[PDB]
Amino acid sequence: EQFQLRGVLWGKAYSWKITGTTIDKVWSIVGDYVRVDNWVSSVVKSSHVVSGEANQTGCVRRFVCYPASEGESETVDYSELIHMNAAAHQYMYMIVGGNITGFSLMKNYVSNISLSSLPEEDGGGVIFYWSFTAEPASNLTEQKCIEIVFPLYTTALKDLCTHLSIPESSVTLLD
Amino acid sequence: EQFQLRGVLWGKAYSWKITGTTIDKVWSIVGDYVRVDNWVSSVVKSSHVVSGEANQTGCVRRFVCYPASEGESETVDYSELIHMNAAAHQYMYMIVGGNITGFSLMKNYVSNISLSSLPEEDGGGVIFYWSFTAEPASNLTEQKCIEIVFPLYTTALKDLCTHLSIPESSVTLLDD
């Protein structure tokens, strides 16, 4: 009959409907965690595992991003896979280092990806769930985090279509 | 060029499609965080806010569960709301105290609830996303965690239908 208060979190969750594809096809790109360069290829130049075994829980990926603008340097993201369930097409990760533009500003950025199949009889398709949280800190606001994260998710959904060779119209942001 | 290794997590995410209702009817039940007794009524006897403002982030609810099986006693759950975006139909909470059966065994049980609408153009309907994580601990297993959580979520979706006055056939667990 007692309890201990914890800190509150910032963040937001997004869901897209994707037609003209299957959970396996989406996963073949999105599920290769340590080769994110083969997914968000418009932002990410290269990626490889630097700790643990590729795509296994606890592993760390290091990926390199193209310069944010001309003159600026490439930036780096280290992120740990903190939960992986490939059979259930879902995983969870956190940035544990690097100077990746914007994302490296957040405190304990944690992200969740979940894929689901819509019923066969409803025309199939995939529900792509993608959320993040970050801890409140004085150099940011929740609104500023959203302005960092959401545009990237949007780009990644576009880059997904490119790699799937399906039109961008295949993707609809729910709500 | 350095990073900081951390521990891994246990958990699982589930999604259901719910027909025959609207996202705002579902939210009126599911979104009323401190009155979970009006939702999972097969399990929860009573509930109220005990810290902060009702359903505002940071608040804590205390709720009483019926005996889990015959002979046992009522148990109690203290859970804190740690994120809330009502207009976006999504929130996050964590158990911060109590002896609630099964759930209080987990270390740092964190849960996420997210509602979305399917396109009007393609039938409508609500996608109900519900996930949890817990921190691995010597006294438990992830499989045990899933045995604790999933039947509760399952029961909760059935109770939701009761309170919405829609057939339980309205709910379908999505393949993952």
Numbering used by the authors:
A (entry chain A): 9 to 183
B (entry chain B): 9 to 184
Verbatim from the authors:
The enzyme is a dimer and exhibits a Bet v1-like fold. We discovered a protein with hydroxynitrile forming activity unique within the Bet v1 superfamily.
We also determined the structures of complexes of DtHNL with 4-hydroxy benzaldehyde, benzoic acid and (R)-mandelonitrile/benzaldehyde using soaking techniques. In all three structures, the aromatic moiety of the different ligands is bound in a hydrophobic pocket formed by the side chains of Val44, Val48, Trp47, Val51, Val52, Phe71, Cys73, Ile108, Phe111, Trp138, Leu160 and Ala164. A part of the phenyl ring is also pointing towards the solvent, therefore, larger substrate may be bound in a way that substituents are located in the active site access tunnel. In the other complexes, a water molecule occupies this position.
